[PDB]
Design a protein around this ligand. Structure first.
Ligand SMILES: Cc1nnc(NC2CCCCCC2)o1
Length: 149
């Protein structure tokens, strides 16, 4: 699978994170990210995908060692951590053809797992609109505790 790169953008309080909402298969909320092009460096892919999806340029804010990386079904996803972005920043995707909406969410209110269906004696997980974000939430919380306190 082709690696994806993007960002976890936080506000000044460190309470809130910026998620984007796509369409169709990407219909829920997730961190802005996308597939690396041929010969493109990771930091440049992250800036491009984030700029294409939010209209915000992270290039001057990326720190090389500050990211969360996960391997999900043998595809690697790396999100650079970008704190301190004012909550009154105007975000606008390049085209509403890929991005429905862009919103701040409270980190403490986001789920860090989906719910089973043990109530119904049925296997699997209930749908959750944050399914794309969820795998990064606990590692983010842990990373913020270590790097800030
Ligand atoms: C698959 C997958 N997992 N996370 C994402 N991120 C997208 C979120 C919704 C908006 C479209 C572009 C970024 O896609």
């Amino acid at each position: 699978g082709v690696p994806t790169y993007g960002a976890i953008i936080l506000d000044e309080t460190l309470e809130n994170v910026l998620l984007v909402q796509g369409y169709l298969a990407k219909s829920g909320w997730g961190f802005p990210k996308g597939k690396v092009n041929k010969e493109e460096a990771p930091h440049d892919c992250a800036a491009r995908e984030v700029f294409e999806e939010t209209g915000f340029d992270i290039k001057d804010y990326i720190c090389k060692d500050d990211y969360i990386e996960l391997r999900i079904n043998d595809q690697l996803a790396r999100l650079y951590i970008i704190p301190g972005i004012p909550k009154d920043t105007k975000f606008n995707p390049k085209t509403r053809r890929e991005i429905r909406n862009i919103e701040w969410f409270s980190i403490e209110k986001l789920p860090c797992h989906r719910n089973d269906m043990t109530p119904k004696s049925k296997l699997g997980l209930a749908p959750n609109k944050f399914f794309m974000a969820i795998p990064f939430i606990r590692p983010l919380r842990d990373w913020l505790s270590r790097r800030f306190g």
